[PDB]
C-alpha cells in the first residue's frame, strides 16, 4: 500500500545522529531518499569484503545484542558458521515488552537501514534466506517493510547476484499474532515454522540447529541497525563510541510520568538520572521520582538513579526501557500490572511458570483489594520465589524478578496492605 494505517507520533531525540538520523522525523523514508543520504553504500563495501572479514569486523567492534541478553554479535555469528549450511538469518521484530517501543520507530521510519543491515549480516553468515518476524500489533510496520523490500529488489539490492557479487538473498516478512513469548529466540523459530510459540529446550542452541534444524542466527532490530554503521565507519572507528566496554549507540524508550516521553539515542555511559531529567525533561508536574521500571524485568528506586545505562553488573542493563513512576503512584498497584502481564504471556509449556504466573497475579490481586489473609501472604511469597528455578525459558525466569524487588525496596508500601 502507499497509504499505511494510522500510527502515533512518537517523539524521538538523538545526540549521536546514527540510528535516529532519519527516524527522528515521523515519516517513511523510501529508497530514493535513503540513497541520496548515502544508503546501501555500506552494503556495497561489505560485498567487496569476504564473509569472514565482515564477521571479524563485527566481533572487533565489540557490538553486543540489544535484544536483552547482551550476547556479543560477532561471537554469535562465528558460532553459526562453525556448522555447515544452509544457514538462516532472522531479524527479531517481536518487541512486546511493556514500555519498549524503540524498534518500531526504526521499522516505521527508516526500514532501509534495517534492510541493509539484514543483507550485510546474511552475507556474513552465508544465509540466502532471511526473515523478519514482526509482532501482529504492528500492521503499518508490516506493510512498510514489505514495500521497502520491494524497492530494494527493484534496485538490485535483493534477489540473485546482488551487485554482481554472486550472493543471493530473499527477505520474507512474517507477522506474529499476539504472543510476547514469540520474542524468545526458539519460540520465534517455532512460530516461523508455523507452530505454536512454545520455546524449545536448549541445547541445542539455534546457532547449531534452529529454523528447520539448520544453523540460524536471530538478532534484534536495534542490533542489526548497527551493522551498516560498523561497516561504513570501520570497526575501529565504531568501538570508540561510548565507554571502552559498552560501545556503540543505544536507543532508550522513556515512558511514564516524564515531560518528553519518547525514544532517545544516547551513549551507554549516560546515567538514569541524566536520561530522565536531562533528556526526557524531568517529571510531570515536577513530582518526585519514586521508581523506574526497566520494562517488566527490573525495578529501580529513587536511590539508584545515578547508575550507568550499560550492561555492567551495577548498571541498568535490560533493553534500556525506562518507565517512570512518581510519588503519587502505587507500587503494589504497579506490581499488579506486571503480574497480570506475565500471567497473560506465559505460554503454558512448563509447570512452574504456567501455574506460578497465574497464582502470583491472583494472589497479588487479593493483596491489592485488601481481601488477603495471612496464608495468602505466605503463599504469595512461596510462588513468587519459586517460578524461576525450574522454568524452561527466560519468561518464567524473570516473572517474579520485578515484583520481588519492589518487596525489598518498598516494604513500607507493601505493609500498608496488611490487616
Amino acid at each position: 500500500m502507499r497509504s499505511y494505517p494510522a500510527i502515533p507520533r512518537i517523539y524521538a531525540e538523538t545526540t549521536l545522529n546514527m540510528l535516529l538520523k532519519r527516524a527522528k522525523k515521523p515519516r517513511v523514508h523510501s529508497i530514493d531518499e535513503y540513497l541520496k543520504d548515502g544508503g546501501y553504500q555500506a552494503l556495497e563495501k561489505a560485498l567487496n569484503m569476504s564473509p569472514e572479514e565482515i564477521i571479524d569486523w563485527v566481533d572487533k567492534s565489540t557490538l553486543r545484542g540489544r535484544g536483552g541478553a547482551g550476547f556479543p554479535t560477532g561471537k554469535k555469528w562465528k558460532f553459526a558458521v562453525q556448522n555447515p549450511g544452509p544457514r538462516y538469518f532472522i531479524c527479531n521484530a517481536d518487541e512486546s515488552e511493556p514500555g519498549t517501543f524503540k524498534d518500531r520507530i526504526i521499522i516505521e521510519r527508516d526500514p532501509h537501514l534495517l534492510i541493509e543491515g539484514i543483507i550485510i549480516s546474511s552475507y556474513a553468515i552465508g544465509a540466502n534466506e532471511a526473515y523478519i518476524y514482526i509482532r501482529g500489533e504492528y500492521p503499518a510496520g508490516y506493510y512498510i517493510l514489505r514495500d521497502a523490500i520491494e524497492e530494494a529488489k527493484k534496485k538490485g539490492f535483493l534477489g540473485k547476484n546482488i551487485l554482481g557479487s554472486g550472493f543471493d538473498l530473499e527477505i520474507y516478512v512474517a507477522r506474529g499474532a499476539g504472543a510476547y513469548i514469540c520474542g524468545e529466540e526458539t519460540a520465534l523459530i517455532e512460530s516461523l515454522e508455523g507452530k505454536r510459540g512454545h520455546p524449545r529446550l536448549k541445547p541445542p542452541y539455534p546457532v547449531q540447529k534452529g529454523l528447520w534444524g539448520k544453523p540460524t542466527v536471530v538478532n534484534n532490530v536495534e542490533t542489526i541497525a548497527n551493522v551498516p554503521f560498523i561497516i561504513s565507519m570501520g570497526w575501529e572507528e565504531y568501538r570508540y563510541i561510548g565507554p571502552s566496554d559498552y560501545a556503540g549507540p543505544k536507543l532508550f524508550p522513556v515512558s511514564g510520568k516524564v515531560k518528553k516521553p519518547g525514544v532517545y539515542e544516547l551513549p551507554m555511559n549516560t546515567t538514569l538520572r541524566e536520561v530522565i531529567f536531562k533528556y526526557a525533561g524531568g517529571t510531570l508536574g515536577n513530582k518526585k521520582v519514586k521508581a523506574v521500571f526497566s520494562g517488566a524485568l527490573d525495578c529501580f528506586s529513587s536511590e539508584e538513579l545515578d547508575i550507568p545505562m550499560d550492561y555492567s553488573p551495577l548498571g541498568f542493563g535490560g533493553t534500556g526501557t525506562v518507565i517512570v513512576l512518581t510519588e503519587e503512584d502505587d507500587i503494589v498497584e504497579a506490581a499488579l500490572k506486571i503480574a497480570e502481564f506475565y500471567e497473560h504471556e506465559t505460554c503454558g509449556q512448563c509447570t512452574p511458570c504456567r501455574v506460578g504466573c497465574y497464582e502470583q497475579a491472583n494472589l497479588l490481586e487479593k493483596i491489592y483489594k485488601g481481601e488477603a489473609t495471612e496464608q495468602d501472604w505466605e503463599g504469595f511469597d512461596f510462588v513468587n520465589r519459586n517460578i524461576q528455578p525450574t522454568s524452561i525459558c527466560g519468561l518464567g525466569a524473570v516473572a517474579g524478578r520485578l515484583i520481588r524487588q519492589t518487596l525489598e525496596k518498598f516494604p513500607e508500601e507493601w505493609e500498608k496492605y496488611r490487616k
Binding site: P5, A6, I7, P8, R9, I10, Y11, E95, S96, E97, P98, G99, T100, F101, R104, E129, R135, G136, E137, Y138, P139, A140, Y172, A174, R175, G176, A177, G178, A179, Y180, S191, L192, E193, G194, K195, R196, G197, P253, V254, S255, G256, K257, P261, G262, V263, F293, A296, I323, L325, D329, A334, K337, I338, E340, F341, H344, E345, C347
Partner: protein
C-alpha cells in the same frame, strides 16, 4: 464450506510467498479474520487443506495466539492497552469513554456487530499512552469528544 474467490486468492498468495506453505498459517488466519470479522471454526479444515497440515495442528495454532477470535464477529476491534504504562496514564478514562459512547465494557461487542472492545497487553506506543487501536489504526486517547470523532469514521 468454501472460501470465496477474493479471499481464496489472498490466502494462495501467502501460501506461495514463503518457502514452505505451513509458514503462511499466521498470515492466513489474519486474512480470514479480517474477511469474516472473526475466524469461523468451519474454515480451519479448508485452511488446513491448503497448507497440507493436519486439522489439529491448525487448531492448536489458532488457539495459541491472542489476536485470533473464533467466538465473536465484529467489523472493528477496538484493542485497548491495559498494560502498566497506559494504565498509569489513563486507560480507565478511555474505557469509561468507550462505554459512554458504545455502551459496552471490555470483551463485549455492540448488538449490531460493529465494534468490540478487546483488552490487550502493551501495544508498543507507551510514550503516547493511553493507546488503543481500531482494527489496524493506532491512536492516543485524548478526550471522550476526540474518541467520538475517531469512532465516527468507521461503519
Amino acid at each position: 464450506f468454501e472460501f470465496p474467490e477474493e479471499l481464496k486468492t489472498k490466502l494462495q498468495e501467502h501460501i506461495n510467498y514463503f518457502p514452505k506453505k505451513r509458514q503462511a498459517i499466521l498470515l492466513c488466519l489474519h486474512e480470514i479474520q479480517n474477511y469474516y470479522g472473526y475466524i469461523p471454526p468451519e474454515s480451519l479444515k479448508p485452511l488446513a487443506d491448503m497448507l497440507e497440515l493436519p486439522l489439529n495442528h491448525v487448531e492448536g495454532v489458532v488457539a495459541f495466539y491472542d489476536m485470533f477470535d473464533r467466538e465473536d464477529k465484529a467489523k472493528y476491534r477496538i484493542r485497548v492497552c491495559v498494560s502498566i504504562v497506559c494504565h498509569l496514564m489513563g486507560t480507565n478514562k478511555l474505557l469509561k469513554a468507550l462505554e459512554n459512547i458504545l455502551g459496552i465494557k471490555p470483551g463485549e461487542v455492540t448488538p449490531d456487530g460493529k465494534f468490540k472492545i478487546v483488552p490487550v497487553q502493551c501495544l508498543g506506543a507507551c510514550s503516547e499512552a493511553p493507546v488503543f487501536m481500531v482494527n489496524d489504526d493506532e491512536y492516543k486517547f485524548e478526550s471522550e469528544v476526540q474518541l467520538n470523532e475517531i469512532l465516527s469514521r468507521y461503519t
